[PDB]
Design a protein around this ligand. Structure first.
Ligand SMILES: CCCCCCCCCCCC(=O)O
Ligand SMILES: CCCCCCCCCCCC(=O)O
Ligand SMILES: [Fe+3]
Ligand SMILES: [Fe+3]
Ligand SMILES: [Fe+3]
Ligand SMILES: [Fe+3]
Lengths: 239, 252
């Protein structure tokens, strides 16, 4: 049984957890420090690649609350404290995504990418792998693995690359004054969820999870990062 | 707009123009899979131990779960709702049985290259190799019956009939196995090296009819090419490791 130090510090969680974070650090790093985001931050990304990024990312954003809904259907009342924690967290964070799909549409519109463009999904297959993995793990994997792959890995990495993109103001400064707030909304809203997810994962796993379970979590987390990396590499192949 | 085949099952000309157009539109995506360099090298017994291991481990999930994709699609059918749905139900109920022993045959093929059942289950391969399996589960789970059959039973089985035939086409790969191990090792390849892809196409055409919307045709084309393209992604990644493995020994 595990009960938690501060929320957003690896120290507050067990030894196997800090080792897990450590084992996933490089897979995460090459995503959150990727050249594509550095160039987006500096208003240096070509329009063609920015268009691909917004289109290719749309399925994961549009369906993100649906991944959580699928995971919610794996929960049962009072079957395990972590499960209750997950149920309550999922029931609240599905609400949180209420407008986020709309914000992505507005962001995309600011770059000339229409709703028709988002729906058409005319992008390379490297960009869709992330969405297929999210649906599969949300559909077929255990509650703990699916939360690790989607809510911990993707949301955590997304908090970091969204912050990087906004870090020096150049990107936002490129938008016309009267379009900036609406265009930057999604980035702003995403630039604590990942640590809350980890807390749920740790509670579910316990203080002494088997090596097999630690390995399953590590591999699921790194697969999410690696499909984000595959996405970004293919985008930059064009640049 | 009902479809009823009159020409031979395994000829494109027996199907409507839109179907022949679909085949044409997907032909280059198919070709670069079924003619891939990796299969020419496998045919000639050239592939490195590293890549053979990656190939056999990476392909396992799609093979192991193939009848489960078909099972999931069967749950989408209802009796007498559409002639193509009855055709799909009866075909799926028959061919789920066909896969009875194929996972075992893949295990036997893998073991002939030193890949253990434990190696298959551990799934220690690059993510480019797992994309295909994630796509297969997603389309089988969430797409329409017609799209999911196109993505799995038409695209993947069709391509697999042709690359397995290519690997077996000149006898070198098989003769390289020792006498006492060859039959068991070659079983999976021989069982797949075929009416299945054409039967799947006939079902797709029956479901779609003679004048499907352009939107449905585009959905089929994109699903079929996605299956081919994920096979291509798989093979490209393998050949990257092949070039590294062979170059290392050449320079050494
Ligand atoms: C690494 C590039 C991936 C493309 C961007 C996908 C962003 C998905 C963000 C999901 C989390 C959320 O929408 O709240
Ligand atoms: C490049 C393809 C990667 C290996 C995939 C294995 C082939 C899947 C075969 C599915 C059909 C069947 O098992 O009968
Ligand atoms: Fe969001
Ligand atoms: Fe979030
Ligand atoms: Fe088979
Ligand atoms: Fe078959």
């Amino acid at each position: 049984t595990f009960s938690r130090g501060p929320l957003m510090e690896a120290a507050s969680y067990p030894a196997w957890t800090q080792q897990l974070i450590q084992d996933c650090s490089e897979s995460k790093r090459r995503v959150v420090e990727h050249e594509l985001y550095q160039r987006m931050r500096d208003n240096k990304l070509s329009a063609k690649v920015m268009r691909q990024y917004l289109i290719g990312g749309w399925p994961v954003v549009e369906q993100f609350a649906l991944y959580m809904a699928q995971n919610l259907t794996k929960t049962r009342f009072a079957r395990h404290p972590g499960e209750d924690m997950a149920r309550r967290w999922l029931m609240r964070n599905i609400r949180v995504e209420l407008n986020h799909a709309d914000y992505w549409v507005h962001w995309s519109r600011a770059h000339g990418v229409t709703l028709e463009d988002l729906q058409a999904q005319q992008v390379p297959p490297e960009l869709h792998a992330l969405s297929h993995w999210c649906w599969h793990t949300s559909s077929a994997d255990s509650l703990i693995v699916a939360i690790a792959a989607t809510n911990y890995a993707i949301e955590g990495a997304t908090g970091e690359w969204s912050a990087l993109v906004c870090s020096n103001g150049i990107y936002a400064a490129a938008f016309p004054e009267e379009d900036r707030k609406r265009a930057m909304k999604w980035l702003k809203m995403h630039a604590a969820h990942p640590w809350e997810a980890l807390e749920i994962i740790v509670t579910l796993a316990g203080l002494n999870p088997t090596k097999a379970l630690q390995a399953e979590l590590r591999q699921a987390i790194c697969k999410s990062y690696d499909y984000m990396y595959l996405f970004l590499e293919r985008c930059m192949q064009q640049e």
